[PDB]
Design an enzyme around this catalytic site. Sequence first.
Site, mmCIF file in Angstrom:
data_model
loop_
_atom_site.group_PDB
_atom_site.id
_atom_site.type_symbol
_atom_site.label_atom_id
_atom_site.label_comp_id
_atom_site.label_asym_id
_atom_site.label_seq_id
_atom_site.Cartn_x
_atom_site.Cartn_y
_atom_site.Cartn_z
ATOM 1 C CG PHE A 61 -35.379 -6.902 21.497
ATOM 2 C CD1 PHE A 61 -36.467 -7.856 21.572
ATOM 3 C CD2 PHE A 61 -34.529 -7.367 20.377
ATOM 4 C CE1 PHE A 61 -37.168 -8.857 21.348
ATOM 5 C CE2 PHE A 61 -34.368 -8.848 20.826
ATOM 6 C CZ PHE A 61 -35.865 -9.519 20.587
ATOM 7 C CD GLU A 91 -45.709 -14.658 32.064
ATOM 8 O OE1 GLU A 91 -45.116 -15.969 31.689
ATOM 9 O OE2 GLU A 91 -45.481 -14.728 33.407
ATOM 10 C CE1 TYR A 102 -38.063 -8.721 33.488
ATOM 11 C CE2 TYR A 102 -35.780 -8.756 33.802
ATOM 12 C CZ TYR A 102 -36.957 -8.330 33.129
ATOM 13 O OH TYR A 102 -36.499 -6.799 33.363
ATOM 14 C CG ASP A 141 -35.562 -5.881 42.354
ATOM 15 O OD1 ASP A 141 -36.440 -5.322 42.081
ATOM 16 O OD2 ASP A 141 -35.662 -6.527 40.588
ATOM 17 C CG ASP A 177 -38.105 -8.036 38.012
ATOM 18 O OD1 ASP A 177 -37.937 -8.322 38.439
ATOM 19 O OD2 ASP A 177 -39.810 -7.289 37.258
ATOM 20 N N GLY A 184 -37.501 -17.215 32.207
ATOM 21 C CA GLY A 184 -37.678 -18.223 33.292
ATOM 22 C C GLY A 184 -38.053 -17.941 34.556
ATOM 23 N NE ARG A 228 -35.863 -12.593 38.563
ATOM 24 C CZ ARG A 228 -36.419 -11.730 38.605
ATOM 25 N NH1 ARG A 228 -36.902 -11.277 37.422
ATOM 26 N NH2 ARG A 228 -36.873 -11.208 40.164
ATOM 27 C CG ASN A 229 -34.336 -9.963 39.452
ATOM 28 O OD1 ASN A 229 -33.669 -10.378 39.629
ATOM 29 N ND2 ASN A 229 -35.127 -9.204 39.493
ATOM 30 C CG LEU A 275 -37.537 -12.413 24.426
ATOM 31 C CD1 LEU A 275 -38.780 -10.893 23.985
ATOM 32 C CD2 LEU A 275 -36.583 -11.226 24.357
#
Length: 287
Positions: free
Chosen positions: A89, A27, A25, A135, A153, A23, A139-140, A20
Site C-alpha cells: 500500500f 482499477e 491508472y 509506459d 503498472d 484517475g 502517472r505510472n 483508490l
Amino acid sequence: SPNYDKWEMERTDITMKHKLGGGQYGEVYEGVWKKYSLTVAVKTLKEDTMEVEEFLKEAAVMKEIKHPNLVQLLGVCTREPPFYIITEFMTYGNLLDYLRECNRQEVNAVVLLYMATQISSAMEYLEKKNFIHRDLAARNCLVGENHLVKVADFGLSRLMTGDTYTAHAGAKFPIKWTAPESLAYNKFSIKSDVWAFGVLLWEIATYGMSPYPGIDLSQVYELLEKDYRMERPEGCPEKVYELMRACWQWNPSDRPSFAEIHQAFETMFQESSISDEVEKELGKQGV
C-alpha cells in the site's frame, strides 16, 4: 504446473476495502492481507480491455524483478476469473497525483531531482534485466514515506531478450514519452525508455505539470522531428537540463544508458558530498 506463480494466494485470504482508483491508472483497490493485518494495494483490469495477456503479464514480471525502487509483488490471483494483482500500500499514492497534492514548501527542487534518482535506480535495474517498460511516467510511478518513488503498472513491459519490435499492431504508447525512432520507424530499444525517463524527469521537476504543455498533438511529431525538447523547469538545476538533453537525444546510439543516468544523479549530488564524477578505480589501470 507450468502455470505456477509463487505469489498465487486465496482471494478470501485478503480482505479488500475501498478503491483508490488512480484517475488514468486503472482499477486500484485497498486490501488487508489477514495473516499480517497490513494494508495493501490491489490492481485489477478494467473490463473493456479483455486483453488478459498484457495486464496479467505484469504478475510474472514483478515475481522475476526485485529492486527497493520497484513495486514489490505481495500476491496474485490467476487461479480464479476475478484476476487480482496485489502489492504494498503506497502512502503518498501515484507520483503525478502526489505532486498535484504535495506540500510545495516541503517538496523543493532537490527532492524532485532525488525522486527522479529513485526512478533511475529502478530503470537501470530493468536495463540489467534487459526489460523495457514503454509506459514510464509520473502517472505510472508510486510515492511512499521519505519521498521514496518506484516504477509501477507493468502492463506494457513486454519481456524480450533483444527484440526491436515490442509493439503489437495497435501502438498503445504515450507519444511525448515515445522515442523519435519509436515514432518514425515504430522501432524500440532500451533507449526508448531513456526518452520517457527524461520527459518524466521534467514532469517531476515541474511539480507534476504536463510535458510539452500548450502544443497541439497534431504538431508534436513535427517539433520533436525539428530536434525540439522542453527547456529547464523553474528551480530545476543547470546540470539536470544537460542530463535531460542527453535523454532527449535524437540518435539512440548517442543517447546514454540508464547505468550512465544513475551515475549522472549521484554525480550531481555534491552538496557537502564527495564529487562522484570519477571513473573505474583511480589508481594506474583506469582503462
